[PDB]
Design a protein around this nucleic acid. Structure first.
Ligand SMILES: [Cl-]
Ligand code: NA
Ligand code: NA
Ligand code: NA
Ligand code: NA
Lengths: 460, 216
DNA sequence: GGGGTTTTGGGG
DNA sequence: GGGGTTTTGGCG
DNA sequence: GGGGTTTTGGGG
């Protein structure tokens, strides 16, 4: 197999050609009719990656690759910009002024994906190591062969990709639309924004809270199975979105089966600058709290920084599998999300009780100090997406006698029967916690079959 | 101002405990919609979303009477006008019914519809399943949240707080997490169902039967 | 022509 | 090919 | 044998 560079491929041969390239963009594989699937992508290499820079505006130049197939599984799922693709038997032609490489996978063409970073996106999600640095993490057909001579091409193209992404935006401003101008678009458009929040709407759907350089916030539904790599704080490029004219309560982007959400390789200058430049916004949440009913979700808490890297565990696993799952039995500390259905005791004034550290007993302060040290003894009855349909509610405790969750309310325990200020703040927090669309993000510690909140604080 | 007629209708139905009589009257006017599909699923759009209309055995017989030269299962890409219709809530298995959410479905019961054969409609966005919309899914979650909260505040009582000693000095104590599971209502099964709206009931035809009635 | 396959020389 | 399925109608 | 493809009947 002889590999040719993009700009040097023949436009007249019409013969099958082969090449290595870096993917900067791609649709998701999508069905067109009763027998055809398609995946369109934008590719570049050392010979084709930037338009005549003078009056070009540092715009990216590229070739396009269109892969056809009879089966969905015979096409590449591109989750990240910057990785490399190897194509065999592609025919080149000029389509509206640009180099279009076409390859029928259902015939004799084939492709193979190589990770530019240490691990592929899927391997990062599963915390897996790559077999080797010359192994395709994905490819068409039952086999893929890498000859010794290719190793240099791959290694060099990788080095090039990192220099390219770290020196240029790659996804230039002409490749997407500012979110605050989304409503002026006639049809679909592309987006480049930071994921501010990933809210599990239900069993198969995530609701992404996005914010781009224009400062505009938008929400969009992202299927879990299709886009399992979405992560809070990360910058992504969204290929093909439309402005939703029917959403009045909040700004919504609509995605299609061919739409794609793509992250950037570690070296991406654009991704790095946007992660730092774009800062979290809570304006939407602050405004929603003034409404009797908010169609916008509000995460009322934040976990200590030392847990930000801790993976979350659903209520289903926490209460229904924590005593039968090997992996869940080995952990005592978990992170989870849920909404509060009810708070006990009902009387907010009883949330703080006097505790006797010698008899391990607590009591009401309605009789005053004669009960010992003041502590919070609150029981949340919660629910989440994973348990949304069942007839259950789950108990999550806030028992701070040992220091766990003492600062949850940003209100030091005190006799609520006498401290009006403390009582009032807790009463307000109570209405917020039980309000529809309010959610909690918290770390819990398992103790004698119960879960106690810790290292978690309200931010409203 | 809601531009999607379907979204506004279905939203008010849910925000009014499935009581179709409580929904705005100025919304119960004839519905002119485009037929996206007709078989195996009959789907119509309002220019923004698509919904599945449920035809009564009467509605079809009337149709076949006033329009003998028109097969319903062949109305794809054609427009229709539903003059007499109603809306009701039904409990379904959303895992099988794609035109629903959280085991709940708002059905468009059609009593009378006229096919405006060969009427070209204005260009619109690609229609999406109303039950896949962010705001509408949220509207439905609000509905369940309210029913759930009312049931829980009625079922749960006596502040049965875990005794603090169980979580204090738990060095030599081991427990099963299912000890934290609390029943939300007096529901019979393992699925919450303590809703206050009265599930609508109306005989409707299966799109398959109307297919046979027009081409055995 | 050339794959994968078995048809192992020949259809459409 | 900057696009529109479905035994897949919450990867397609 | 049958796809896609053009070889349009025949290799290995
Ligand atoms: Cl335990
Ligand atoms: Na052959
Ligand atoms: Na053969
Ligand atoms: Na042949
Ligand atoms: Na042939």
């Amino acid at each position: 197999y002889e590999y040719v560079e993009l700009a040097k491929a023949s436009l007249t041969s019409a013969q099958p050609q082969h090449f290595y390239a870096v993917v900067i963009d791609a649709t998701f594989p999508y069905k067109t009719n009763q027998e055809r699937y398609i995946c369109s992508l934008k590719i570049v290499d050392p010979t084709l990656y930037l338009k005549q820079q003078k009056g070009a505006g540092d715009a990216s130049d590229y070739a396009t690759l269109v892969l056809y197939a009879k089966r969905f599984e015979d096409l590449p799922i591109i989750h990240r910009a910057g990785d490399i693709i190897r194509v065999h038997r592609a025919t080149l032609r000029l389509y509206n002024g640009q180099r279009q490489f076409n390859a029928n996978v259902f015939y004799s063409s084939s492709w193979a994906l190589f990770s530019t970073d240490k691990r592929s996106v899927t391997q990062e999600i599963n915390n897996q190591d790559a077999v080797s640095d010359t192994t395709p993490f994905s490819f068409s057909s039952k086999h893929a062969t890498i000859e010794k001579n290719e190793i240099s091409i791959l290694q060099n193209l990788r080095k090039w990709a990192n220099q390219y992404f770290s020196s240029y935006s790659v996804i230039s401003s002409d490749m997407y639309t500012a979110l605050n101008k989304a409503q002026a678009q006639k049809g679909d458009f592309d987006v480049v924004a930071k994921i501010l929040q990933v809210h599990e709407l239900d069993e198969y759907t995530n609701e992404l809270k996005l914010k781009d350089a224009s400062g505009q916030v938008f929400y969009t539904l992202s299927l879990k199975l299709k886009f399992p790599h979405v992560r809070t704080g990360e910058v992504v490029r969204i290929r093909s979105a439309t402005y939703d004219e029917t959403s009045t309560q909040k700004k919504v982007l609509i995605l299609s089966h061919y739409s794609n959400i793509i992250t950037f390789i570690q070296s991406s200058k654009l991704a790095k600058e946007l992660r730092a430049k774009i800062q979290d916004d809570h304006s939407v949440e602050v405004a929603s709290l003034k409404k009797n009913v908010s169609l916008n979700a509000v995460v009322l808490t934040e976990v200590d920084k030392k847990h930000a890297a801790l993976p979350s565990t659903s209520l289903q696993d926490l209460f229904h599998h924590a005593d039968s799952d090997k992996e869940l039995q080995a952990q005592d500390t978990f992170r989870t999300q849920f909404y509060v259905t009810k708070i006990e005791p009902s009387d907010v004034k009883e949330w703080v009780k006097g505790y006797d550290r010698k008899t391990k007993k607590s009591s009401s302060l309605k009789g005053a100090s004669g009960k010992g040290d003041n502590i919070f003894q609150v029981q949340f009855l919660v629910k989440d997406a994973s348990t949304q349909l069942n007839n259950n509610t789950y108990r999550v405790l806030l028992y701070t006698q040992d220091g766990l969750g003492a600062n949850f309310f940003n209100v030091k325990a005190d006799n609520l029967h006498k401290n009006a200020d403390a009582r009032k703040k807790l009463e307000d927090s109570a209405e917020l916690l039980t309000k529809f669309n309010s959610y909690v993000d918290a770390v819990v510690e398992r103790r004698n079959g119960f879960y106690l909140i810790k290292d978690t604080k309200l931010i409203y | 101002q809601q531009q999607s007629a379907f979204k506004q209708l279905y939203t008010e139905l849910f925000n009014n405990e499935g009581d179709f009589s409580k929904v705005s009257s100025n919304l119960k006017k004839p519905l002119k919609c485009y037929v996206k599909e007709s078989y195996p699923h009959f789907l119509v759009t309002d220019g923004y979303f698509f919904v599945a209309p449920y035809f009564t055995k009467e509605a079809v017989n009337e149709f076949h009477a006033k329009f003998p030269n028109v097969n319903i299962v062949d109305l794809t890409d054609k427009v229709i006008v539903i003059n007499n219709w109603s809306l009701e809530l039904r409990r379904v298995n959303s895992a099988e019914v794609f035109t629903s959410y959280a085991n709940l479905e708002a059905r468009l019961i059609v009593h009378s519809f006229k096919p405006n054969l060969q009427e070209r409609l204005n260009p619109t966005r690609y229609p999406v399943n109303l039950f896949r919309d962010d705001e509408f899914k949220t509207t439905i979650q609000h509905f369940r949240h309210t029913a759930l909260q009312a049931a829980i505040n009625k079922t749960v009582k006596g502040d049965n707080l875990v005794d603090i000693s169980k979580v204090a000095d738990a060095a030599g104590k081991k427990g099963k997490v299912d000890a934290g599971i609390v029943k939300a209502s007096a529901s019979k099964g393992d699925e919450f169902s303590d809703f206050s709206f009265k599930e609508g009931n109306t005989a409707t035809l299966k799109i398959a039967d109307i297919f046979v009635q027009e081409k055995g």
